[PDB]
Design a protein around this ligand. Structure first.
Ligand code: HEM
Ligand code: HEM
Lengths: 457, 457
């Protein structure tokens, strides 16, 4: 397998027996992709164990992969380990099963449904603010991941199940204790590297019902969901939307639970992390934070509560969120498996190769962005935004298999930022890491938790 | 596991995850051991996958391992893969099972038994000579491994089973076709490297009856042996010695067959290879070849047939054989597993570590041998031989688990050399590789087969 890119005349780091190139992950995924881009140019290939991965950076080729040939050739992501029934989660499902699930779930994420969820989201912005004020009146530095983590979970439990908890102050509530375990996978941890080198072990793990999603958590949520369903049946959240959908091919009961679980997984740590990065940037660029506070006060005088429509009115807020996601595209990479031999944009790609789009590297490419390391919201101004290629800037992916939750996530984050910035200004501590450094693990996160001073307005 | 030698303050090449140091075998075992000895000194540690291996070179420590603490601590070699019933072969057996087998088999290899086998061995020296003469009368270069391979097999089939074949001229005889498959393992081949990196797969292979000894061969020999046994029962070879032994704890029928098979394995390619190296050295040092021919003619005038006692009379023959085995110790390394935490000669060795004695590296160590790359039989002269440390010079190992076949092998080789040198002189071709280069694989063998001109005396 390790002779593939050599045979195709594609450059890339020379692989080692068994390992491929995984030893080059010692400084994390993003540094690897940046260094490869710099060394090899527009396309390169490497090996995750024995799995060939072809990295592409030409926006035309990216469009072909993510959009034009999504259904025919590049439909699925790569398998990553033993998943049991979570096989049915839309992010893991393949081919026609995926296409069916995306159809069934698409109406659930429309703006019309989002707009109806906003009062629920807004409520926990109030909770977030009350909790923040408690920490602002006692001038103690605040750990963002903790406070935005609780916010993220509060929005999840209410908008997905109508479970209303102040999780920051109720950490040992059984529901919170279980859902909080649905964190992102670290694909550079020993287990996932071992599976990468020994992928032939995954069926053995599956037959023994060993799953990368914690069984006690999925068991808890399966029986919780069944309780909720039959209390509702009979006598605004994602559960009810899905319950209504299978009220017709329609969603299996097991499929329903898989989606409830994956939505938590998809939105919990992702939202929290992006909010922490945004607040870090605002704290370290006071002028941006002030300008944003000025916009919010203009659109919503007298600390008026945010609404769906007023959120969409805030252009500078949009610019700040988009520029943070340029710097910190937490997915790092996008991937699709090539399901058949194809030739796209003049290049032959063999069946079975994983095609990868290195979002982080492209987001920080000097050839596409002036001073790419700098936080500059004007990049996304109404004037400049037309000049941004949607296949270079891909924090939510692109095409039919992009982030189905993108509108919700953006609304969720913006509602939080508005409420928080109406009430507080955030400033650096001396224990604030400046400049922020990224972890060298398999997740895009700060090396040390972001800690900030919170001051009442 | 990879932090062990670091923790003990023992030097050695820094291992890679999963692989340990096996990528350093790319130029073979012997080059690796030479380079480590040079770089790290008297002791060093490395990792075969996750298995720690401690290399030692102090003759006092070597004596402790191979002799003093053989029974208590360093009894067994390391496991190497799926072996099925060949588990019972004496070279593979462990602990009390080994100790029992060595006891049962020891009387079989006494000089008294050897002396009785010599007329049988001698017969195939005559066959070897007749076959060589056929190739000498038609001045075609001879490939040593082919001619000494056939000799080695002829001696094996007759001295182990009383099966009398001219294998050179009967290659498609079913017995020869099967026994010829019992070649030495190449532990650097893809299968054995894979097992080294994935040793957790060996039990899976065992439960499926996948064995590194070819099943069709062992099946053939098992049923051949059973035929022979019951033709002999009722109505001088190793089989009869073993048959007599179980005529008493006594050797199982399955144990008996395991030994018959392992003796072929142990003696077939080993004898052939050493004979080829010796003839290479004689051909490239005509003065040595002549002196040896002079000794043989003195001891056995008029091409007198060699006998057990006249062979032992030939001191220069002994020197030539011993010096070739110094240059080419085909086992390369000796190994023992440490079965309990011990401290020997001031050094702590943890349970489970493989202790390795790098025979090849010590045989070519400039600090023990003047001009170690040169073929100099006088090293082993009656005068100089006292100065040779038996823990530095170890072509047949040392101690209670040394080569049980050593006397036989030496007699076998000497009888062949005598008969051959009485009749022929061996000279280089232009297709003779000079200087000889060694293979970079996992076996100590010439890079290209040794080919020589054979001239009738
Ligand atoms: C700031 C927060 C988030 C970011 C940055 C983000 C980013 C992404 C990215 C990059 C992908 C891969 C798209 C591709 O491969 O082209 C993805 C997929 C997905 N995301 Fe999000 N996401 C976020 C929040 C959410 C939320 C709140 C949900 C709620 C349901 C969600 C649900 C999903 C699902 C289900 C997929 C797989 C879609 C499919 O395979 O059909 N994500 N997300
Ligand atoms: C020139 C030819 C040969 C050489 C260089 C050679 C070398 C060796 C070496 C280095 C060992 C390991 C000793 C140790 O670990 O200390 C060994 C073991 C052994 N050899 Fe030989 N050998 C040769 C021929 C033979 C022959 C003809 C036989 C016939 C039976 C034989 C049978 C064995 C057996 C059974 C063992 C394992 C002993 C035990 O574990 O108790 N070898 N040999």
């Amino acid at each position: 397998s390790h002779g593939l890119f050599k045979k195709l005349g594609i450059p890339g780091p020379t692989p080692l027996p068994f390992l491929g190139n995984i030893l080059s992950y010692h400084k994390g995924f993003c540094m690897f992709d940046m260094e490869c881009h710099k060394k090899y140019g527009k396309v390169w290939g490497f090996y995750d164990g024995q799995q060939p991965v072809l990295a592409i950076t030409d926006p035309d080729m990216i469009k072909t992969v993510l959009v034009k040939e999504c259904y025919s050739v590049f439909t699925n992501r790569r398998p990553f380990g033993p998943v049991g029934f979570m096989k049915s989660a839309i992010s893991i499902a393949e081919d026609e099963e995926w296409k069916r699930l995306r159809s069934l779930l698409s109406p659930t994420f429309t703006s019309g449904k989002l707009k109806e969820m906003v009062p629920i989201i807004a409520q926990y912005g109030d909770v977030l603010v009350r909790n923040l004020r408690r920490e602002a009146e006692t001038g103690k530095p605040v750990t963002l991941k903790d406070v935005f983590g609780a916010y993220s979970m509060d929005v999840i439990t209410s908008t997905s199940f109508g479970v209303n908890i102040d999780s920051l102050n109720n950490p040992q509530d059984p529901f919170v204790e279980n859902t909080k375990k649905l964190l992102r996978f670290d694909f550079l941890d020993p287990f996932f590297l071992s599976i990468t080198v020994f992928p032939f072990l995954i069926p053995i793990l599956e037959v023994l019902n060993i799953c990368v999603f914690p069984r006690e958590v999925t068991n808890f949520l399966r029986k919780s969901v069944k309780r909720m369903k039959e209390s509702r049946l009979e006598d605004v959240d994602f559960l009810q939307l899905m319950i209504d959908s299978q009220n017709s091919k329609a969603l299996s009961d097991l499929e329903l639970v898989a989606q409830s679980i994956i939505f938590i997984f998809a939105g919990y740590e992702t939202t929290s992390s992006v909010l922490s990065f945004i607040m870090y940037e605002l704290a370290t660029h006071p002028d941006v934070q002030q300008k944003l506070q000025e916009e919010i006060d203009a659109v919503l005088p007298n600390k008026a509560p945010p609404t769906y429509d007023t959120v969409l009115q805030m252009e500078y807020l949009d610019m700040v969120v988009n520029e943070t996601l340029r710097l910190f595209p937490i997915a790092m990479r996008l991937e699709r498996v090539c399901k058949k031999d194809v030739e796209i944009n003049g290049m032959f790609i063999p069946k079975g190769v994983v095609v990868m789009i290195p979002s982080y590297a492209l987001h920080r490419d000097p050839k596409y962005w002036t001073e790419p390391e700098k936080f500059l919201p004007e990049r996304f101004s109404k004037k400049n935004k037309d000049n941004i290629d949607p296949y270079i800037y891909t924090p939510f992916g692109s095409g039919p298999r992009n982030c189905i939750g993108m509108r919700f996530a953006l609304m969720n984050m913006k509602l939080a930022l508005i409420r928080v910035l109406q009430n507080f200004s955030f400033k650096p501590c001396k224990e604030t890491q400046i400049p922020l450094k990224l972890s060298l693990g398999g997740l895009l996160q700060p090396e040390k938790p972001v800690v900030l001073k919170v001051e009442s307005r």
